[PDB]
Each structure stands twice: as C-alpha cells, then as structure tokens.
C-alpha cells in the first residue's frame, strides 16, 4: 500500500549519521530528478537507484517533507510508465536489467530516463532528449540558472527566478529543438518542478524560498545535501506554481518537425482541466504501453492505477481502462 503522511512533519536534520552522502559505485543509477538522486546518494533510497514505489514515497517524505498526495501521484505515475509492475521496481535513471524480466512491447520499462513518458523537454539543468542527453547535470544550463538567479533573485533562486527561467527554457527549446513537445503531463510537471528547489532545497529552519547557489549546485550536480541540512518544516510540493505561470502564461503545444513552429494543441489538458490530464494519462499514455495485458499484468496495472488515483488532488472521477 502507499505509505501515509508523516506522523511528525517538523523540520529536522536529514543529513545525519544514518544518511551520509556517498559517491557512486560502479552500476549505481542516477537520473533526471535531483530530489530522488539526492535521496539515493544519502541512502534514503537504495544507493544503486532502483527502488519500490513505497520506498520512494517514504524517502521523499522523510528526507524532504514532500507532501503525501504529491508523492503518491508522482511515484505511481512514474512507476506505471517507467517501472516494472510485476517486480514492483523502478529505476530512477537509465533502463536496467535490475528491474527484472520485461513485459512485452510496447511497454519500455525504461526508468525515469525514458523520454516522453514522465521526463520531458525544457528541464532547467538537463538538456532536451533531442540534443543527446536528458539526464546528466549540464554545467552550461546550471550557469544559466545562476545567471537568472543573479538577475531576478538577488543571487538566490526563488519563485521570481523560476518564472523567468521556466519561460527562457521553453523559448530556447522552441528555437532549437524541432521535436519540442510541451503538452499534457509534461506541461504540468515542467511548471511544478521549478518550485521544488525553492520549496524543498531551502533549509527548513529558514524556509524563506531563497535557495543559495552553493546549495543549488550541491543538489543539482552532486546529489548532496549541504552539511547540517534540515528538511522543510511542513509537508509541501508545488506551492507557488501560480507565480511561475503568471510570469509568462503559456498554452500547451509542440514544434511540428521544425524549429520556431510551436503549434497549440487543443486536445491537450491545461491548468483549467487537471482532470483531463489524469484521464489522458491513464486512457492514452498507460493504456498505449499495455493495450492488452495478460492476467498478472492486468492485476498489477489495476492496483497501481488505484494507488495513482489516491494521489489525484483535483476532485476527479476515477477512470478504469481495464474494467472494474
Ligand atoms: C516523488 C517522487 C518523484 C519522482 C518520481 C520524480 C521524478 C522526476 C523526473 C522524472 C523528473 C524529470 C522532469 C524533467 O524532464 O525535467 C523530475 C524533475 C525534477 N524533480 Fe522530481 N521526482 C519526484 C519528487 C521530487 C522531489 C521530492 C524533489 C525535490 C525534493 C524533486 C525535484 C525535481 C527537480 C528540481 C526537477 C527538475 C530538475 C531540472 O529540471 O533540472 N522531485 N522529477
Ligand atoms: C517531532 O520532531 C521534532 C524534531 O525531531 C521534535 O522536536 C518534536 O518533539 C517531535 N514531536 C513529537 C510529538 O514527538
Ligand atoms: C520526439 O517527439 C515524440 C513525441 O511527439 C517522442 O515520441 C520522441 O521520443 C521524441 N524524440 C526525441 C529524441 O525528442
Ligand atoms: C549542455 O547544454 C548546452 C546548452 O544547451 C549544450 O550546448 C551542451 O551540448 C550540453 N552538454 C554538455 C555536455 O555540455
Ligand atoms: C526573489 O528575489 C528578488 C530579489 O531579492 C525579489 O525582488 C523577489 O521578490 C523574490 N521573489 C520571491 C518570490 O521571493
Ligand atoms: C477515459 O476512458 C473512460 C472509459 O474507461 C471514459 O469514460 C472517459 O471519457 C475517457 N476520458 C478521456 C479523456 O479519453
Ligand atoms: O515528483 C514530481 C516531479 C515533477 C513534477 C511534479 C509535479 C507534481 C507532483 C510531483 C511532481
Ligand atoms: O498545481 C500544480 C501544477 C503543476 C505541478 C504541480 C506539482 C505539485 C503540486 C501542484 C502542482
Ligand atoms: O498550485 C496549484 C494548486 C491548485 C490549482 C492550481 C491551478 C493553477 C495553477 C496552480 C495551481
Ligand atoms: O490546474 C489545476 C486546477 C485545479 C486544481 C488542481 C490541482 C492540482 C494540480 C493542478 C490543478
Ligand atoms: O494531484 C495532482 C498534482 C499535480 C497535477 C495534477 C494534475 C491532475 C490531477 C491531479 C494532480
Ligand atoms: Cl503530507
Ligand atoms: Mg527533461
């Protein structure tokens, strides 16, 4: 079952004796998420980067005070599209034999590195998949984050910086990635993720929304909590995303095989239709990976879809692609 919320959600030291940072060993997997990467590199998750959904939910809550509903929604969304539903294992990065025997195609079980399922374009510190690497820390992109922090945040990353940088990334992908896609699930996640450094990488004794660049580099590049890091003082995820959207409101769309051809998609969900985002994720995205599953896969899909629905925070009706 999905873990419940923390019994005690106070700020506390999370870079503690039981959770030291360690460098990668051969075979250890890290991916496009600095949050999960840091949890693995401090042993809140298995240090090889392969974990169960329950391990992930417990880790994001314990290590960073990510809220329960957000933890459930993201984890089961990722697991459904990128994880092995029979073995209950998900890679936080590249595809690996460590998640067990694969299901039939068209399911990919590609880990969080799989482009276009959860991971997508216009990430802050990772390049678009079209440019060759959607998962490793990129120094040039991080230096741009530093520059935007200097210009809009007095040298710190905050929600104002997030609003400007989110738009800059989108405009750079429009100008250079002929395959740029910015619809449905990615349209939502791209905005939410820009709040996370301000909400969750800021030491919880301060919780002022102002992330310094030493801490930012530590998390984004090295998957490493600052010495004496205290987690956030209460559960949260995407609060302040309205500030990021308001700075430069966008419509969902994609380039259409050429640069500078961004074409709005009226069949995409947007922030006015969160329940459509959920329904398409299940009916189209998940269903297309598993169109006619065998008995044990069908059971695992339905269980994980029930868990996903527990995380749906927008008053939506559950949908059932494989029946009740
Ligand atoms: C709850 C389970 C979570 C999963 C499965 C997850 C997975 C992912 C994935 C696959 C991405 C790639 C999105 C992209 O293409 O840019 C991403 C982005 C990101 N996640 Fe998470 N995430 C989770 C929770 C968290 C938490 C708790 C934090 C912080 C504590 C966090 C911080 C970030 C950041 C900062 C990015 C954007 C990085 C960048 O654009 O450079 N995530 N997440
Ligand atoms: C919750 O944890 C904090 C920090 O560890 C501690 O100060 C506080 O006493 C705890 N609360 C309860 C009810 O145990
Ligand atoms: C190109 O875009 C499509 C989605 O429209 C996606 O399936 C494909 O993986 C993308 N490839 C790259 C390398 O961006
Ligand atoms: C990092 O991002 C820059 C800017 O988009 C890109 O030119 C470069 O190839 C990327 N990769 C590395 C390894 O720097
Ligand atoms: C970001 O920092 C700048 C400079 O200190 C400030 O003007 C702006 O109000 C800050 N934004 C937020 C949301 O804290
Ligand atoms: C999803 O499928 C259900 C039937 O299982 C249907 O009622 C619903 O309208 C579908 N939603 C979308 C957005 O296709
Ligand atoms: O874990 C996550 C990663 C990226 C985006 C998210 C948006 C909402 C809730 C969780 C998210
Ligand atoms: O309202 C939102 C929009 C997009 C992403 C989010 C992630 C977490 C929490 C709320 C979010
Ligand atoms: O953060 C949020 C929470 C709930 C609803 C939202 C709607 C739009 C934009 C952001 C939102
Ligand atoms: O865009 C939105 C509108 C209303 C409620 C939401 C809840 C979560 C995430 C997004 C939302
Ligand atoms: O719980 C949520 C968090 C972020 C985005 C969402 C979009 C739709 C439905 C639920 C959502
Ligand atoms: Cl919570
Ligand atoms: Mg990306």
């Amino acid at each position: 079952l999905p873990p419940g919320p923390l019994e005690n959600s106070s700020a506390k030291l999370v870079n503690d004796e039981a959770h030291p940072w360690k460098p990668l060993r051969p075979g250890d997997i890290r991916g496009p998420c600095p949050g999960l990467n840091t949890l693995a590199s401090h042993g809140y998750l298995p240090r090889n980067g392969v974990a169960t959904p329950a391990q992930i939910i417990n880790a994001v809550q314990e290590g960073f005070n990510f809220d329960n509903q957000a933890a459930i929604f993201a984890t089961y969304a990722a697991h459904l599209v990128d994880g092995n539903l029979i073995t209950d294992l998900l890679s936080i990065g590249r595809k690996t034999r460590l998640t067990g025997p694969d299901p039939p195609p068209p399911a990919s079980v590609g880990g969080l590195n799989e482009h276009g399922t959860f991971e997508g374009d216009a990430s802050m510190t990772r390049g678009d998949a079209f440019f060759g690497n959607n998962h490793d820390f990129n120094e040039t992109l991080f230096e741009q984050l530093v520059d935007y922090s200097n210009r809009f945040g007095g040298g710190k990353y905050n929600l104002t910086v997030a609003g400007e940088l989110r738009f800059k990334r989108i405009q750079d992908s429009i100008a250079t990635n002929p395959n740029f896609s910015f619809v449905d699930f990615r349209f939502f996640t791209a905005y939410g993720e820009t709040t996370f450094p301000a909400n969750l990488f800021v030491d919880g004794r301060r919780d002022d929304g102002q992330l310094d660049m030493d801490a930012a580099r530590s998390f984004f590049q090295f998957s490493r909590m600052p010495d004496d890091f205290f987690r956030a003082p209460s559960p949260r995820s995407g609060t302040g995303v309205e500030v990021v959207v308001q700075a430069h409101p966008m419509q969902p769309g994609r380039n259409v095989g050429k640069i500078n051809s961004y074409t709005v998609d009226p069949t995409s969900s947007d922030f006015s239709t969160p329940c459509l985002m959920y329904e398409k994720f299940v009916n189209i995205t998940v269903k297309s990976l598993y169109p006619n599953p065998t008995v044990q896969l069908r059971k695992a899909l339905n269980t994980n879809l029930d868990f996903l629905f527990q995380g749906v925070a927008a008053g939506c009706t559950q949908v059932f692609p494989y029946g009740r």
Side-chain angles (χ1 to χ4, degrees):
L1 293 173
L6 298 175
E7 289 181 57
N8 182 337
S9 66
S10 298
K12 68 177 196 180
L13 178 68
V14 290
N15 187 357
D16 64 4
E17 196 172 44
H19 299 95
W21 181 85
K22 295 183 177 194
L24 299 186
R25 304 159 303 179
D28 285 347
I29 296 168
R30 299 291 181 274
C33 179
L36 301 179
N37 287 349
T38 299
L39 294 163
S41 288
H42 282 266
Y44 283 96
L45 290 172
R47 293 180 181 275
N48 74 352
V50 175
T52 68
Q55 285 174 322
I56 292 167
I57 291 159
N58 280 318
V60 299
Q61 292 187 158
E62 186 68 12
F64 285 121
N65 226 336
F66 208 62
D67 69 273
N68 186 245
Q69 274 210 296
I72 289 171
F73 190 76
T75 301
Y76 293 105
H79 186 54
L80 281 159
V81 300
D82 289 338
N84 193 308
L85 305 178
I86 296 299
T87 66
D88 206 39
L89 298 168
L90 172 62
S91 170
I92 71 172
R94 63 164 174 90
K95 183 169 176 60
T96 175
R97 294 175 288 236
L98 291 168
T99 53
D102 275 344
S108 36
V109 187
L112 295 184
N113 285 11
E114 187 74 14
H115 175 67
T117 51
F118 196 125
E119 188 284 322
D121 298 333
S123 300
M124 296 182 286
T125 67
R126 271 63 183 170
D128 290 4
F130 181 88
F131 303 126
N133 186 328
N134 71 353
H135 51 275
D136 291 326
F137 173 82
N138 181 301
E139 178 63 27
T140 296
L141 294 178
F142 185 77
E143 288 181 19
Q144 174 170 253
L145 181 151
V146 173
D147 184 46
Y148 274 64
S149 295
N150 288 335
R151 291 159 56 183
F152 300 108
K156 311 310 175 54
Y157 183 94
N158 74 14
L159 296 171
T160 307
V161 180
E164 300 310 309
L165 187 62
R166 162 49 50 237
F167 187 63
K168 169 63 163 156
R169 291 300 288 124
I170 292 165
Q171 295 299 319
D172 284 354
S173 287
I174 289 170
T176 59
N177 180 356
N179 206 50
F180 178 50
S181 182
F182 205 64
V183 296
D184 288 306
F185 190 44
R186 183 54 187 160
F187 182 83
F188 281 71
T189 61
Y191 283 91
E193 288 153 11
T194 70
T195 73
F196 298 165
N199 292 340
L200 300 150
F201 292 164
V202 170
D203 188 283
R205 296 171 281 191
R206 195 163 76 251
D207 195 27
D208 65 356
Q210 317 299 306
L211 178 63
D212 75 71
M213 292 302 99
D214 292 334
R217 180 177 291 283
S218 196
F219 288 115
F220 278 104
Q221 180 166 24
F222 296 111
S223 310
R224 185 172 198 168
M225 294 170 173
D227 191 307
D228 203 50
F229 185 71
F230 273 54
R231 69 178 188 195
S234 63
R236 78 283 300 277
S237 53
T239 179
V241 67
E242 72 287 350
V243 174
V244 183
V245 174
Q246 287 184 33
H248 293 287
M250 282 288 300
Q251 300 170 94
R254 57 175 64 78
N255 271 338
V256 295
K258 294 186 330 200
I259 63 171
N260 303 129
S261 67
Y262 190 77
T263 304
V264 172
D265 183 358
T267 75
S268 181
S269 57
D270 83 335
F271 295 124
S272 75
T273 53
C275 295
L276 182 61
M277 188 278 287
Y278 157 69
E279 291 193 16
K280 291 184 76 186
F281 183 79
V282 171
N283 286 12
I284 297 163
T285 308
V286 174
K287 185 70 175 277
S288 294
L289 295 167
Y290 297 96
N292 215 309
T294 53
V295 62
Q296 290 311 112
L297 265 173
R298 186 184 158 278
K299 185 206 175 88
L301 282 154
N302 282 332
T303 297
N304 283 285
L305 286 164
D306 287 342
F307 297 164
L308 174 75
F309 186 70
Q310 295 182 38
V312 173
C316 307
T317 302
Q318 188 169 3
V319 297
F320 299 95
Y322 306 109
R324 282 308 284 249

